[PDB]
Amino acid sequence: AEINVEATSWRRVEVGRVLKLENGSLAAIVEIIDHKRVLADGPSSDPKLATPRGIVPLSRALLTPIVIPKLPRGARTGAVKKAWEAYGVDAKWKETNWAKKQLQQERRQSLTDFDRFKVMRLKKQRRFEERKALAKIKAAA
Amino acid sequence: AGTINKPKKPTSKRKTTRLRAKISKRAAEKKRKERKLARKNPEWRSKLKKDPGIPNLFPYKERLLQQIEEERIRRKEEL
Amino acid sequence: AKSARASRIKENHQRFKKNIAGPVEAARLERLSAKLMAIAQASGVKSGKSIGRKDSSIVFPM
Amino acid sequence: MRYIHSEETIPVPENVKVSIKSRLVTVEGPRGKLQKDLSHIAVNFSVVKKGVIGLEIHHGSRKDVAALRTVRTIINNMIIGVTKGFKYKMRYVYAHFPINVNVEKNAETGCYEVEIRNFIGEKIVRKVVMAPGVEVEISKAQKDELILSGNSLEAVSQSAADIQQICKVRNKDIRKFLDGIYVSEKGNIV
Amino acid sequence: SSFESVVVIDGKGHLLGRLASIVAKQLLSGQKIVVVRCEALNISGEFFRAKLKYHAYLRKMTRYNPTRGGPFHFRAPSRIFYKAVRGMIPHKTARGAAALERLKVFEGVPPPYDKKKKMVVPQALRVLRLQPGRKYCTVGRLSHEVGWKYQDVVARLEERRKAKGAAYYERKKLAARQLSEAKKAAAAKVDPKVSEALAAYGY
Amino acid sequence: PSEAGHRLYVKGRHLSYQRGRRNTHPKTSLIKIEGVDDTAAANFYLGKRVAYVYRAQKEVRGTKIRVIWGKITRPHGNSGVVRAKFTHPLPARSFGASVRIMLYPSSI
Amino acid sequence: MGRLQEYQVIGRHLPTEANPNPALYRMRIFAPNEVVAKSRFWYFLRGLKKVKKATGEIVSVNVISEKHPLKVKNFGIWLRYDSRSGTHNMYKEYRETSRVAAVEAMYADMAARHRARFRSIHILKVVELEKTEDVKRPYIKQLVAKNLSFPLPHRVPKISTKKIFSAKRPSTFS
Amino acid sequence: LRSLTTVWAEHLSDEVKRRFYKNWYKSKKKAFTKYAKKYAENNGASITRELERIKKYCTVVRVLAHTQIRKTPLKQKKAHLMEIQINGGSVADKVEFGRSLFEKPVTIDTIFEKDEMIDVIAVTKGHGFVGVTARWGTKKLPRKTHKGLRKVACIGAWHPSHVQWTVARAGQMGYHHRTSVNHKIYRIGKGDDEAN
RNA sequence: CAUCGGUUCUGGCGGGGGGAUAAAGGCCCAGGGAAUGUGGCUCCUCCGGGAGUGUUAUAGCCCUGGGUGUAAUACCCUCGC
RNA sequence: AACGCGACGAUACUACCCGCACGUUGUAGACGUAUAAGAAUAGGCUCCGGCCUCGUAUCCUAGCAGGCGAUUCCUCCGCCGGCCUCGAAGUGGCCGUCGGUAAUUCGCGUAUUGCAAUUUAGACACGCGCGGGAUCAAAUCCUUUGCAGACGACUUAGAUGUG
């Protein structure tokens, strides 16, 4: 009996699933109300990732691969925080490819005009030498 | 029916002012006539309406009847 | 009576076309084509082998 | 109400191989292979166990949940078709004019064609073409019997229905004129 | 909100009314709009409902003379989209005509729009608007049943265009790969101060 | 040589006048500025000068190009559409015409 | 019907030489504000004890906040509403963290499913289910089940309405 | 369908050259003169390019054929030219067949055969301006009808307040293009046969 | 353009008062309780995980009272820049 | 479609084509007016390592509206010629020549438009000019015809001939 099934695998909301909100804050599920509202708590010490405990809608939230294992259902702020610095959610969130992309976005939006001109000129250095490399690979084959 | 390949004449939903005014006049006459028949109505009506009661699926209904009996006994003792 | 657009009459005509008049028309066709063929037989840029360009618009004029 | 989760199970035999990609179910067995596209129903296919297909639906309605049973039965019918096959046997009876039935296999299509003649003395020849993969044979153990076999239950039963429906008595009393071809027995090849 | 010289929209997977409203607003605002592949356009609801609508539209004609003044029934998918667009535009005004002359609609993707970038409109996409389980129909299929003769010609032209686009796809994949090893090989010869400053700024 | 542009203004499209469903007041015009989508984004451009540039037939004082000038007065609605007041009301033929919103007077 | 705050409204009849200390009456009102709270309290006083606003007065109005707004709770609601047939009972169950949110959701769903407005709905009891065994409706029984974890199929991505044109086809998988 | 190219022969007659002119007696007869030089320059590279183009891009091939009008007793000297489709075979076969048929007379007996049932395309005899009675077969009004009896009494008695397109009116009758079908050929007689 | 005056649109900031001197909640102290049974123990298996026991253990949760606390914050009112 | 389209032949001139020389020439409206897979959305992409809310991206973008001269680099762009190629309303790929070119650094000029006044700058079509290259044509009125016809219109014939 050989079975080859190629299908989809959604990230699944569960107690301990970590959500990213639109403001950059991070939270974790502590209790499931319904399929459109959840109870989430962000105990992170970093203020940018902090989220006050309360109800958030799933439409107002995203899905991250971080899940806190063995997190009790309905755990309060102290227990969720003990699990949070037990698991190191902040470090894994920084290692995820999303937080790099938003951090790169503030590194774009915080630029001065002098910073933009420096970006232009350093990019021109990199593109000149990349065009030289491009000539070497194109000449080889 | 052959409605898909050969449709018939459409039914217009665009109301006319004459029809709207006539319908409004008949409607107001109907409320006035129902008021007159309610005033002249000889059908018997109860002084106290039929109470619907308490739903059976209510989980604390037995507790509510406990408080009902307790309050009735307390009122009887007070009176 | 059945119409000219009747499905049964159309199927009868299709069977007639495939089974009866078909070989007759094919034999006449091949003999006429034989007579007509009998009468008929009785660089890339510089040579024209390569199809080059000859010697209202769909796009917005910009 | 909207159902949070609903699941169904499909057992698979050891000789049957199942491939599911973009809801295109391929079921391969000893007798051949069958293909069926099921992209019109929102269903999650999974491997919950060795030899068990899991059908799942999330946040669906009652009709969407009830479609899973139809999906299960079609998949099980494909499995039964590639494993044991499907066989419909029909009988044809006549009162006075013997029905002359002839079965041939067209080379350029690969499909079977059945010609029926002398149906209540009619001079027309009724030609019915089977679906591909359906084999028609004259039974030799019994009298006036056609046997249709294949891997697709829908195709075999539809060909049997077409053979039954091509011989319809017209403008006569059906209590008196009993002529026709009728599907008698349904089962598996093995 | 971005001003372009001309915006090319693939008609595949779009909804007729919503796409028509959006492009009509763009045309009346002053944006030049070209819509290609109107045969793959979608209308919600079951297909027999659209058949009812088009046959009811076929019923209308001027009684005393059908050659003038009557509703002229254009059977093409692009012309049906043009009628839907025109119904949302004051076409009997000079401004309306000057907006309608900024629109072009086609079946398939005729050249040189085959070598131009095509936009999609999220507010009119079926996968972003319709609920699952709801039926949908094809404007091309409706046109083919009501008398549009050029379904198969557009089909084979789209087949050959897709073959040529596939050829351009392996060329583009080859260029993407050799650019990737070009950047990787050049990365060794990048000045480290340039690397650190560019990484700090965000590239 | 330089391959750069020289644009020091921001583009816009002139939609219509201040109007109801029937009555239209050409004393105030409606503009989309390029890249603005919100009232907060449009709040930057309040008080900025705005110029509409057109061409004529005759040659007066060394130019065949005429400019009508104005300023951005207040936001309109929620989609960043702005209201503009000019020294002369805009032509009605300019519905869909491009307009130049200046960066001055600046408060930066 | 709005941002409902919940009020304890206590009133009484005006003092008289015959009755120097009249009996006090307290009700729990779900109202948009204090004016509607007093108005509905007087309306129910006419309906029950026949005490008028001219002959009575309001002694106390207090805002009752939830003890635990951060705790997910199940609410059972016993209600009477008026339709063209007459008066009807319903028992319904909801899942919210506060009585005010439970009552607002009850209003919204009651209007959506049976076309009842505020003046045609009478709230009799709103009780917090102390145990999960008391839950009766299957759509709340499925939410209070063991280890409930579900996916989110076909989520339309968030695209700004002012972003009219997109350069790629969006995905609906997250 | 859209015509991509046409390929012309090197030598063409004066009777088919007359088809391109209205005042041929005053004309210098310069038609096709520079085109005949394209059969000479570059060994026909241009005409070979059109032949390769027509072999590659097109799917329907039609020869151009003109009738020899000088063999008829008609006073006309300008010939009749049409497009005749080549059916059967591939596009390359059609192009090679047409190129072989250039500057060549094809008789009637190799296109059509005795016992063949064909279609006839022609123009109806003209009658000029004709009234409704002969134009539509309408019933004549009784004798001494006021304002005429070879007419239609009611062109309209009902709404619309217009004359409908289906009401019989007087006008041109005849000189219509007509395509009649199912015409049997009884004989294809030969001109050189003195007993045809 | 700057400084003004009248009318008006918009944005931000610093304080005060009230409610259950908000209600929460965080950290401690003292009690009481249960399973959508944690750890542990027993029994089955596809060895993946299931069934039984119960009061915190190798997770925690609910109720009451007290301290921090005249805490902060939401909401309403209110003084100005 | 008499305000839809294609192919072909002959095209006298002030007609046609090429070069530059500019428009008190006109344009529902240039200012980087840059960017080609197809397909699915209860699934996709790949360099086969992995990746996917996100175009918030990529390319290009510095110099008298962008000069002159070096240092330095072999990068980018454009015009031509050749070979291919592109028919859905036809255009791109490679090679060769030529010309320009801050990727690095430096030197001389910028003023005076006087504290803002469009930054007159692009494309298409049109016209007047020269200096050249190529070509010497048709239609209508008139006479005639009757396969046509109220008149127009239509079928014909009128240049040396089977008139």
Provide structural commentary.
Chain C: This is DUF2423 domain-containing protein. Chain C: Residues 1-20 are annotated as: Disordered. Chain C: Residues 1-42 form the DUF2423 domain. This is part of a larger assembly, with eight protein chains of eight kinds. Helix content of chain E is 50%, strand content 8%. Chain E has helices spanning 16-29, 47-59, 77-86, 94-100, 126-129, 139-146, 151-186, 192-201, and strands spanning 7-10, 33-36, 42-44, 103-105, 136-138. Chain E is elongated, with a radius of gyration of 23 Å. Chain E starts with 6 loop residues before the first strand and ends with a helix. Chain G contains three helices and six strands; from the N terminus they run E-E-H-E-E-E-H-E-H. In chain G, strand 4 (73-82) and strand 5 (87-96) form a beta hairpin. The chains are: A alpha+beta (141), B mainly alpha (79), C mainly alpha (62), D alpha+beta (190), E mainly alpha (203), F mainly beta (108), G alpha+beta (174), H alpha+beta (196). At the C-E interface, loops of C face loops of E. Strand 1 of chain A pairs parallel with strand 2 (17-21) of chain D, so a sheet runs across the interface. Chain E binds two RNA strands through helix 4 and helix 7.
Helical content band of chain C: 55-70%
Q: Globular, elongated, flat, extended or rod-shaped: what is the shape of chain C?
A: flat
What are the secondary-structure elements of chain C, in order, as H or E? Answer: HH
Q: Tell how many strands the DSSP assignment of chain C holds.
A: 0
The computed structural class of chain C is: mainly alpha
Number of helices of chain F: 1
Biggest interface goes to: C-H, 18 and 25 residues
The strand line-up of the biggest sheet of chain F is 1-2-5-4-3-6
Give a quick account of the main beta sheet of chain F: strands, pairing sense, barrel closure: 6 strands, antiparallel, barrel
Organism (chain G): Chaetomium thermophilum (strain DSM 1495 / CBS 144.50 / IMI 039719) (Thermochaetoides thermophila)
Protein name (chain G): 60S ribosomal protein L20
Keywords (chain G): Ribonucleoprotein, Ribosomal protein
GO molecular function (chain G): structural constituent of ribosome
Question: What structural keywords apply?
Answer:
part of a larger assembly, 8 chains, E: 203 residues, three-stranded parallel sheet, G: 174 residues, alpha+beta, three-stranded antiparallel sheet, 3 helices, 6 strands, 30% strand, RNA-binding, ribosomal protein (chain E)
